């Protein structure tokens, strides 16, 4: 069925809320959306499984050796980095139009728009572009950070498609003040991307594609079907005809149901957002693998954690005292994380005590640890006035009002291991008087900007469990209030036009100072020292509750080659970063990568 019609069916447990047109990822920054988009949009510079930059739509990787990189000292130990990129003469959109520097200028104009709800306002403050000609441009970073040359580099969007509407949007934006009209301005920009990112719009041809594949159709709630993009210039060894001509992502929200489908055999490979660790080693799957599929476990920077709303303007937050570190420490002492990873994963996915995964050398193994101890949790909560009500749940008075310790606990509905986790933790939390109100929804709902990036508006008011998948551009921005080098605030609120990813609203000036300096440190050891100090502070304050570090399980049909992932392949550590060379060996596809060396033993 695979080599038969020369297709690739990929199974996933989460579906993108929007696709293609949301190129700054302001509406959705879902990992599944980014993975799928690798097939549809190619970078100028990619990042392979061997953790190396490599040219894709650009002619070559810029280096000091070839003069494409220029570092100049601007004083005070800071630098200016210039990076020359040349777009290949054959880089083309799926409609036949050339990919040019006008597409780069367009991308920058949108990212630079005042009030644009960008994920990383720091980048947008210090990065600029200079256009030499239709295919030569220079990216300018000032001050430069240690990770600016780290691929992938994808700074372009289809101007001939989105430009006309953008001009209208800009004209309308002139009548709005980013301060007083923040809500309206945010709506204006969201609507711009939505015109080019919903199922109906895309199915009617709203977008064009630069990757090895182009969209055929999006059946929302069911699948995303793509077909070969003949305009993509990188041809795999032996010719593109020997590789897959159609790629279909099938979405099954309940992970157990996805597991059943994967065991059944109709799915050729699994996404980085599919089955959980425990499922990958379950007997019902393992015993059905012989002669059919290979199962791999790939470590990555995947941090399962629980974010905590600490915005004091939400009275529920103040009532529960979530803004006090003692409350967060108490909750963590009540989470039997070691018991959970032992029972659920045989300890193979270790308890995390910091936000940086071990695969990143910045990881600090020495930070403060919070062992499972209900007595300690009880003492901390008692110190803050809590006393058990007759239903066994803690109560206290705040602002003259009687408040109960019932906390919202949100996660991705359908993800069985997380649903089990909530139940597991809830049993212990109840023993000390903390009640949990489960409020789960699909990935496409909870990871949409209007939910995840709106804690300041009290959209979610307690605990929110999920995992952050990181690339090597670590700057601690997930927990910075402000980057001191650019003055960019990283907590999304109406006041900063909903920019940033510090979704829980934490602020620690020392943490900001350390991380802001660390990203400017080009010496690996000094950089690590600063990040280690930042992690020590982070662990004492627990702005989020660390749970465990994950490894992604991949189930791949025998015969399919080059569908390989590594800790940081494609930047975030998932398959599909070399989508043009994935194919069936019986069709002549030439194996160029082997999963073994990047995966856990056996």
């Amino acid at each position: 069925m695979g080599p038969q019609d020369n297709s690739l069916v990929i199974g996933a447990s989460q579906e993108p809320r929007v696709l293609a047109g949301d190129f700054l990822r302001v509406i959705s920054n879902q990992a599944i959306k980014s993975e799928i988009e690798q097939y549809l949009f190619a970078p100028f510079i990619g990042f392979n499984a061997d953790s190396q930059n490599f040219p894709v739509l650009a002619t070559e990787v810029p280096t000091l050796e070839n003069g494409r990189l220029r570092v100049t000292d601007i004083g005070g130990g800071k630098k200016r980095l210039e990076m020359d990129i040349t777009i290949r003469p054959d880089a083309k959109w799926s409609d036949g139009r050339p990919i040019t520097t006008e597409d780069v200028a367009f991308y920058f104009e949108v990212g630079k728009a005042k009030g644009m709800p960008v994920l990383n306002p720091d980048f947008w403050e210090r990065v600029n572009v200079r256009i030499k000609d239709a295919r030569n441009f220079t990216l300018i970073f000032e001050p430069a950070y240690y990770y600016d040359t780290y691929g992938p580099i994808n700074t372009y969007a289809p101007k001939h498609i989105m430009g006309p509407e953008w001009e209208r949007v800009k004209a309308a934006a002139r009548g709005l003040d980013p301060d007083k009209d923040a809500e309206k301005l945010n709506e204006l920009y969201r609507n711009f991307f939505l015109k080019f990112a919903t199922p109906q719009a895309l199915n009617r041809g709203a977008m064009v594609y630069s990757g090895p594949f182009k969209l055929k159709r999006w059946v929302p709630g069911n699948s995303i079907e793509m077909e070969r993009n003949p305009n993509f210039p990188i041809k795999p060894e032996g010719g593109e005809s020997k590789y897959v001509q159609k790629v279909v992502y099938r979405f099954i929200q309940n992970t157990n149901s996805l597991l059943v489908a994967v065991i059944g055999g109709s799915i050729d490979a699994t996404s980085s957002v599919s089955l959980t660790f425990d499922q990958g080693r379950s007997p019902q799957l393992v015993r059905r693998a012989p002669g059919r599929f290979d199962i791999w476990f790939v470590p990555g920077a995947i941090w399962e954690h629980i974010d905590i709303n600490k915005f004091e303007n939400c009275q529920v937050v103040k009532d529960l005292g979530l803004n006090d570190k003692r409350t967060r420490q108490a909750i963590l002492h009540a989470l039997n994380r070691e018991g959970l990873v032992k029972a659920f994963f045989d300890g193979l996915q270790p308890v995390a005590h910091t936000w940086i995964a071990p695969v990143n050398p910045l990881f600090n193994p020495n930070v403060k640890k919070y062992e499972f101890d209900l007595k300690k949790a009880e003492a901390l909560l008692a110190e803050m006035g809590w006393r058990k009500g007759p239903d066994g749940i803690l109560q206290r008075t705040v602002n003259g009002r009687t408040v109960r310790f019932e906390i919202e606990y949100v996660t991705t509905a359908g993800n069985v291991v997380r649903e089990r986790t909530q139940q597991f933790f809830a049993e212990d939390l109840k023993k000390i008087g903390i009640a949990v109100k489960i409020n789960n929804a699909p990935s496409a709902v909870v990871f949409a900007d209007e939910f995840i990036q709106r804690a300041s508006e009290c959209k979610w008011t307690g605990m929110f469990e999920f995992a952050w998948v990181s690339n090597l551009q670590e700057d601690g921005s997930l927990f910075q209030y402000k980057n001191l080098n650019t003055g960019a605030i990283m907590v999304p609120t109406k006041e900063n036009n909903y920019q940033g990813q510090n979704i829980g609203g934490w602020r620690n000036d020392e943490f900001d100072r350390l991380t802001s300096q660390a990203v400017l440190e080009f010496d690996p050891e000094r950089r690590k020292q600063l990040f280690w100090r930042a992690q020590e502070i982070w662990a004492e304050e627990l702005p989020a509750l660390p749970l465990y570090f994950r490894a992604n399980p991949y189930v791949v049909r025998k015969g399919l080659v080059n569908y390989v992932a590594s800790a940081y392949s494609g930047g975030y550590g998932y398959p599909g970063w070399n989508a043009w060379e994935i194919g069936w060996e019986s069709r002549g596809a030439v194996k160029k990568w082997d999963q073994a060396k990047y995966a856990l033993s056996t």
Binding site: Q14, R25, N29, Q30, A31, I32, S34, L119, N120, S272, V273, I302, S443, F447, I452, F466, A467, W468, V469, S470, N471, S477, L478, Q501, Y572
Partner: peptide, 5 residues
Amino acid sequence: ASKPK
């Protein structure tokens, strides 16, 4: 910009 899953 870390991604969610």
